[PDB]
Amino acid sequence: EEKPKGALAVILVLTLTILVFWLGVYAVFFARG
Amino acid sequence: SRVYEAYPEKKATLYFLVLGFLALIVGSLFGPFQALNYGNVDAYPLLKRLLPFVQSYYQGLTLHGVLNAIVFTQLFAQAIMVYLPARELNMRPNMGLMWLSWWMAFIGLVVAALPLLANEATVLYTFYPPLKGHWAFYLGASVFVLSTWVSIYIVLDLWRRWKAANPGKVTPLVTYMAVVFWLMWFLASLGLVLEAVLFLLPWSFGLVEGVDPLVARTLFWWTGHPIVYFWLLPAYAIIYTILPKQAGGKLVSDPMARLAFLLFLLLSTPVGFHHQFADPGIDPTWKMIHSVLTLFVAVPSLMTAFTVAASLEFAGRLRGGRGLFGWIRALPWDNPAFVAPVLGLLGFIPGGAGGIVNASFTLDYVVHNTAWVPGHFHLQVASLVTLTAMGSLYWLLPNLTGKPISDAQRRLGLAVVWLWFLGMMIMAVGLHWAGLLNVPRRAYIAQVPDAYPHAAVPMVFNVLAGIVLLVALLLFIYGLFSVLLSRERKPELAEAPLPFAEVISGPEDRRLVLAMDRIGFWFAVAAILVVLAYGPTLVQLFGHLNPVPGWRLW
Amino acid sequence: DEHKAHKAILAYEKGWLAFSLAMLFVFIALIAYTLATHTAGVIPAGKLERVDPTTVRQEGPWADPAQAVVQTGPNQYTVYVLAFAFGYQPNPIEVPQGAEIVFKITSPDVIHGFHVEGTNINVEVLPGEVSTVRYTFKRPGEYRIICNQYCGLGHQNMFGTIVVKE
Ligand code: HAS
Ligand code: HEM
Ligand code: CUA
Ligand SMILES: [Cu+2]
Ligand SMILES: [Xe]
Ligand SMILES: [Xe]
Ligand SMILES: [Xe]
C-alpha cells in the first residue's frame, strides 16, 4: 500500500533496545575501569 | 497407512519429533527448580523425593542442558531441515539413511543417557576438561551428533537429484536454506568432531591420561557458537516460509531470505572466540577480529527482523490492518501456530540485544559466567526456538499423523504459549538483573542463601517465573499427550500439502538469487574464512600442547 | 499493491542495512577506543606462558604464598595468584591502590574464573597456563574475587579477597 510504518516502528524499538543495552553497559565498563 | 507408504518420510520425521519433544519434557522439569534456586529458594529436597536418582543440583543442570539445548534441538532440526525441503521438492529422501540417522540419534541418546542418569556424567552440557566424564557419555554424544552428518548427506542428495530434473533452475527457497544450513553445520561440526576424536574419546577410554583444556575449549567453541545457529535456522526456515501464510499474508522477498541464510553459511563458524574472551593464551587481536565478525553475524538477524516484520505487516493489512499498529490487531491471535512464534520474536529483541553486548569484547567482562548469560539465551533458545517448535505442532503433527486438533486443544495451546512466553519474560528480567548484580550462573546459590543479599528483588522474579513455567510445562504435557493419545484419524489432512507461504518476487531478484545460488563457491568461501580465523591460533596451540590429568568433582 | 510494496520494502531494507553497518562501525571504533586506554589492561596476555599444573605449589613463584606480592616497578606489583579447588592463594591478597597490579594466575587442577567484584578483572584460569591481567585500583577496601567457572560441587563457595591498601 505505502511506507512500512509498522515494520519501521518495530526496527525502532529494536535499535533503541540495542542502544540502551550497549551504551548502558559501555558506561559500566568505564565505571569499573 | 497408504499415507506412509506414499510418504514414508512422514514417519521418520514423526519419530524425530516425538523423541525430541520427549527429550524437551524431561530436560524442562529441572527448569522450575533452577529458577526457584535463582530466587533463593531450595526446592531440591522435594525434587529428590520425587526423582530418587537425582544426586545434586549440578546433575539436574547437566540433564537440563543436554536434553533441552542438545537433544531436543538437534532432533527438531533433523526433522525440519529434512522434511521441509523434501515436501517442497515433493521428493523422497533416502529412507535407508533417513532411518539410519534416527537410530543413531536414538542409540546415541540411550548410551549417553545411562551415565547421565547414573551420576557418572555431572560435567554439564559443555563438558570442559579436566572434569572427566564416563566414556559412554562421550561415545553416546558423538554418535548422536554424527547423526547429523547423515542428515547432511540426505539433504545434499535430494538437492543434487532435483538439480538434475531441473537443469538451470534456481534452487527453490526452503531447499536452498536447508542446503546452506547443513553445509554450514558440516563446517561447524568439525571443531567438535576433532575434540572428541583427538582428545575426549581416547581420554575416556583410557588411552591417554591428559588433555590440554585450552585447545579443548578452543575446538569446542569452533562448533559451540555455530551450533546455536544450527538450533536457530530451522526456526528461521519456518518463520520465513510458513508463518506468513499462517498470518494471512506472504513473504515479501525471496532474495532477502536467501541472503540472510547465505550470510549465516559464511559468518557462523569463525566467531567462537566471543565465547573465549575471558580465556588466557589467546591473542587479544584475534579476540578483536572475532568480535568484529560476531557483530557481522548479527547482520543476518537484523535483515530478518525487517523482512519478517514487513511480511507480518503486509499480512495484517490484507486482513484489514488499520494504522501504524492496526495490522497487529488484525493478525490471527486465535491461531497458536501464529501466536507462538510471534511471541518468541518479541522476546528475541531483548535476547539479541543481550548478544550484541556479550560480543563487544571488553564489555563481556561485565557479564561473563554470570546469570545474565542464561537470561540472554533463554530468550533465544528456550523462548523463540521452543515456542516455534511448540506452535508448529498444530500444523505439523496433523500433517504427519492425520489426527485433527479440537478447539479445546487449540485454546489449551494458546494458554501454554502465553504462560511460557510470559514466564520466560519474568525470568529474563530476573536473571539479567542478578547477572549485573555479579551472581554467577551454574550455581546452587539456595544452599548459600546469604551470599547474595543485593539480588533481593530479582530473586523474586525468578521465583515467579519458576512457578509460571512449571504450570505452562504441565499443561503442555497434558496438551501434548492429549493429542498424541487420541484415536481420531482424518487420513485426508495428513495428505494436505504443507501450508507454505507464497513469495512476492521482483525484477532485480533474478541476477541476485543467481549469484547466491553459486553454492559450491560460497561453501569454499566459508571454508576459507574458518581457516583464516582459526588456522593461525590453532597452529601455535598444537605446537605447545600441555595436557593435564582428569578430575572427578562430584 | 503487492508489487508496489515489494519495491518500497526492498528500498527501506537498503537504507536499514546502511544504517545497521554504520551503527556497528561506531561500536567498532568505540571498541577501538577502549583498546588504546588504561582500561585495556584487564585483557589476558596473548603470549603463551606454559606451566606444569602438578608442580606449581612445590616449585616456582606459586610455591610460597608469602612471596605472593613483589614490587617489580616503581609503582608496579606482580602478584602470583593460584586459583585451586575451592579457594584462592594468597588469601587475602594485599596491594596498594593507585599502583599497577599485574596478576599472574593459574590453577593446579581444573579451570577456574577470576572475577573481582566491581572491577573489570574477569579472566579464565587454566591448568598449566598463566593468566596475566593488568589493573589499577583507584578505590580502597576489600575487593571480592568470585569463581565464575563451574569447578565442581564446592564451586558456589569459592570466593577470594583482595584488600587493596587505603
Ligand atoms: C539459539 C540460541 C542463540 C541465539 C539465536 C544467540 C544469538 C547471539 N549470541 Fe548467543 N552469545 C553471544 C553472542 C550472540 C550474538 C551476537 C547473537 C546474535 O545472533 C543475536 C542477534 C539478534 C538480533 C540482533 C535480534 C533480531 C530480532 C528479531 C529478528 C526479532 C524481531 C521481532 C519482530 C519483527 C516481531 C514483531 C511483531 C510484533 C507483533 C510486534 C556471546 C558473545 O559474543 C556469548 C558469550 C557470553 C558469555 O561470555 O558467556 C553468547 C552466549 C550464548 C550461550 C551460552 C553458551 C554456554 O553455555 O556457555 C547460548 C546457549 C547462546 C545461544 C544463542 N545465542 N549464546
Ligand atoms: C521449563 C522452563 C525452563 C526454565 C524455568 C529454565 C530455567 C533455567 C535456569 C534458571 C537456568 C540457569 C541455571 C544456572 O545458571 O545454574 C537454566 C539453564 C539453562 N537452560 Fe533452561 N530453563 C527452562 C527450559 C529450557 C529450555 C527449553 C532450553 C532450551 C531448549 C533450556 C536451555 C538451557 C541451557 C542450555 C542452560 C545452561 C545449562 C548449563 O549451563 O549447564 N532451558 N535454565
Ligand atoms: Cu573455581 Cu567454581
Ligand atoms: Cu555464540
Ligand atoms: Xe546425547
Ligand atoms: Xe562427545
Ligand atoms: Xe553450546
Side-chain angles (χ1 to χ4, degrees):
Chain A
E1 52 162 85
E2 195 48 60
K3 177 178 65 186
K5 291 191 84 167
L8 300 167
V10 167
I11 70 134
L12 210 278
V13 166
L14 188 57
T15 297
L16 284 194
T17 308
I18 288 152
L19 283 200
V20 160
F21 274 73
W22 204 93
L23 260 42
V25 180
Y26 185 79
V28 181
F29 171 71
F30 284 110
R32 296 189 189 170
Chain B
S1 212
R2 274 179 283 265
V3 179
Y4 287 178
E5 295 182 320
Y7 310 107
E9 52 261 38
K10 284 172 169 65
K11 198 179 179 179
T13 304
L14 181 52
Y15 275 45
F16 269 101
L17 265 185
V18 187
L19 204 69
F21 277 96
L22 279 180
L24 179 63
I25 303 156
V26 187
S28 294
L29 309 177
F30 298 78
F33 299 79
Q34 288 143 199
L36 307 161
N37 170 73
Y38 269 88
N40 211 211
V41 184
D42 187 333
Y44 276 81
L46 190 276
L47 183 57
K48 219 278 197 186
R49 179 157 57 88
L50 277 46
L51 290 154
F53 70 83
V54 166
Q55 305 282 346
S56 67
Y57 172 80
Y58 296 101
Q59 209 202 348
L61 184 59
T62 304
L63 292 169
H64 184 68
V66 174
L67 287 177
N68 288 172
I70 288 167
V71 186
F72 167 62
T73 59
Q74 180 185 295
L75 285 170
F76 185 66
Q78 284 179 300
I80 293 311
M81 307 313 275
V82 182
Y83 187 72
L84 297 198
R87 301 313 317 150
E88 183 191 37
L89 301 182
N90 187 42
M91 303 177 66
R92 182 186 304 177
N94 196 315
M95 282 318 289
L97 275 161
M98 207 187 164
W99 274 116
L100 173 74
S101 52
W102 183 82
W103 279 103
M104 278 179 72
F106 180 76
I107 290 157
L109 173 53
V110 169
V111 173
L114 304 163
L116 285 166
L117 287 165
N119 197 46
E120 302 280 308
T122 298
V123 281
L124 298 175
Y125 86 132
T126 44
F127 50 88
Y128 301 123
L131 318 161
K132 195 165 189 187
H134 186 292
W135 58 265
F137 164 82
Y138 299 98
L139 188 54
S142 298
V143 176
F144 179 80
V145 167
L146 287 171
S147 160
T148 51
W149 276 28
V150 181
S151 287
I152 305 152
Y153 188 89
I154 292 166
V155 175
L156 297 179
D157 178 52
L158 288 166
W159 184 68
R160 223 287 84 160
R161 290 161 39 188
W162 181 95
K163 270 289 184 159
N166 306 275
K169 291 213 66 199
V170 176
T171 304
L173 186 73
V174 177
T175 303
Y176 175 81
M177 292 164 165
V179 166
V180 295
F181 176 80
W182 292 113
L183 275 190
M184 183 280 263
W185 172 242
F186 175 83
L187 227 76
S189 56
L190 302 176
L192 174 75
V193 192
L194 298 143
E195 197 188 10
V197 170
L198 301 166
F199 306 128
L200 292 185
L201 299 163
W203 186 41
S204 73
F205 275 142
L207 288 289
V208 278
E209 308 317 301
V211 163
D212 189 314
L214 186 59
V215 311
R217 76 199 324 265
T218 305
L219 299 172
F220 177 93
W221 286 117
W222 160 324
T223 309
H225 175 77
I227 189 176
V228 316
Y229 297 109
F230 174 75
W231 305 331
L232 178 72
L233 270 57
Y236 271 14
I238 295 161
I239 295 141
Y240 270 127
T241 75
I242 303 170
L243 171 64
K245 169 73 166 183
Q246 301 293 147
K250 287 191 181 197
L251 173 56
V252 296
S253 183
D254 173 302
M256 282 315 93
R258 278 183 198 265
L259 200 64
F261 272 81
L262 180 56
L263 278 212
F264 278 136
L265 170 73
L266 259 63
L267 309 162
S268 296
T269 304
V271 298
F273 290 167
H274 75 245
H275 293 285
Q276 290 190 291
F277 283 140
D279 297 31
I282 294 165
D283 195 46
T285 307
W286 283 113
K287 289 174 165 187
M288 185 70 161
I289 282 169
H290 272 54
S291 169
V292 156
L293 297 182
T294 303
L295 292 162
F296 283 7
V297 83
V299 167
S301 286
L302 284 154
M303 279 183 54
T304 301
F306 198 89
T307 308
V308 171
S311 291
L312 281 166
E313 176 167 10
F314 180 65
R317 295 290 164 84
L318 266 61
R319 298 266 295 181
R322 343 201 176 304
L324 175 60
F325 298 119
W327 54 278
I328 315 166
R329 202 46 208 150
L331 278 342
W333 293 99
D334 52 292
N335 189 40
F338 166 76
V339 180
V342 168
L343 299 181
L345 287 150
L346 272 13
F348 205 71
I349 309 148
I356 296 177
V357 150
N358 307 333
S360 295
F361 203 161
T362 54
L363 283 66
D364 187 14
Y365 293 129
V366 180
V367 281
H368 186 65
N369 295 346
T370 64
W372 160 285
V373 182
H376 153 72
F377 68 62
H378 280 90
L379 291 154
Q380 312 289 260
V381 63
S383 217
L384 181 71
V385 184
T386 320
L387 293 171
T388 308
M390 286 194 177
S392 298
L393 269 26
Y394 287 93
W395 51 268
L396 186 47
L397 230 60
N399 185 270
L400 300 162
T401 51
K403 300 182 198 168
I405 295 163
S406 63
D407 201 292
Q409 283 153 335
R410 186 196 59 68
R411 290 178 310 151
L412 146 71
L414 268 159
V416 191
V417 172
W418 277 95
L419 299 194
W420 196 285
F421 165 68
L422 265 9
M424 286 292 148
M425 274 321 299
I426 312 165
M427 217 172 75
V429 183
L431 276 311
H432 279 85
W433 203 334
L436 296 166
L437 285 160
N438 296 160
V439 177
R441 67 137 142 174
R442 290 176 152 190
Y444 195 18
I445 71 153
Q447 194 182 59
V448 296
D450 307 304
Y452 318 102
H454 281 71
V457 276
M459 263 151 177
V460 186
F461 295 158
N462 291 343
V463 189
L464 221 192
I467 321 143
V468 181
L469 309 162
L470 207 170
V471 185
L473 164 59
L474 281 156
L475 297 161
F476 176 77
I477 311 158
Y478 182 79
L480 196 69
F481 280 92
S482 54
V483 188
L484 278 155
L485 273 43
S486 38
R487 290 305 151 203
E488 295 267 331
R489 168 132 195 170
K490 291 186 156 190
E492 57 271 25
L493 60 84
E495 281 171 322
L498 285 172
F500 289 121
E502 264 180 299
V503 175
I504 314 161
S505 238
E508 301 213 61
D509 302 9
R510 174 84 184 288
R511 305 183 97 162
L512 196 67
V513 169
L514 240 54
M516 292 193 277
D517 217 29
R518 275 236 63 195
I519 294 160
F521 162 89
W522 291 119
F523 184 56
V525 168
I528 288 160
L529 293 174
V530 182
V531 170
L532 276 187
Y534 277 95
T537 318
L538 282 167
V539 171
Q540 283 192 284
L541 295 203
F542 281 87
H544 299 71
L545 268 177
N546 190 33
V548 321
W551 285 83
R552 167 154 187 158
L553 301 171
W554 67 96
Chain C
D1 203 81
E2 187 168 315
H3 207 167
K4 181 205 181 172
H6 179 81
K7 301 280 90 157
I9 288 163
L10 211 40
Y12 290 82
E13 179 97 0
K14 282 194 158 183
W16 164 236
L17 252 169
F19 174 70
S20 313
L21 247 74
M23 163 179 45
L24 271 35
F25 275 114
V26 159
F27 297 146
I28 293 164
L30 286 173
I31 303 163
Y33 171 74
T34 72
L35 259 58
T37 64
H38 70 278
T39 70
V42 278
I43 313 170
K47 210 178 173 203
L48 301 150
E49 201 193 343
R50 266 59 183 92
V51 285
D52 213 336
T54 51
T55 58
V56 66
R57 52 179 163 202
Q58 288 176 44
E59 57 175 315
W62 297 272
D64 177 32
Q67 289 293 191
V69 183
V70 69
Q71 191 171 289
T72 177
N75 213 193
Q76 201 191 36
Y77 292 96
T78 307
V79 186
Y80 290 77
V81 205
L82 198 77
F84 56 82
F86 332 123
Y88 294 92
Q89 185 188 108
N91 203 335
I93 294 173
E94 301 170 337
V95 279
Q97 89 167 50
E100 182 173 290
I101 306 106
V102 181
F103 307 91
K104 298 179 89 81
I105 322 124
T106 176
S107 183
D109 30 25
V110 314
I111 306 167
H112 296 287
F114 194 88
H115 195 198
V116 178
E117 180 158 24
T119 66
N120 282 157
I121 311 165
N122 195 356
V123 59
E124 298 278 314
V125 200
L126 270 61
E129 178 59 60
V130 192
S131 327
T132 311
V133 286
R134 319 207 150 210
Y135 191 66
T136 305
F137 297 82
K138 287 151 190 63
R139 198 178 285 176
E142 300 185 4
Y143 287 86
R144 194 224 256 169
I145 305 144
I146 322 175
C147 175
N148 58 10
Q149 184 63 252
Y150 161 72
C151 66
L153 305 191
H155 150 71
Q156 74 285 300
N157 228 114
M158 178 183 178
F159 301 96
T161 306
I162 291 169
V163 189
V164 286
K165 284 195 148 60
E166 187 216 295

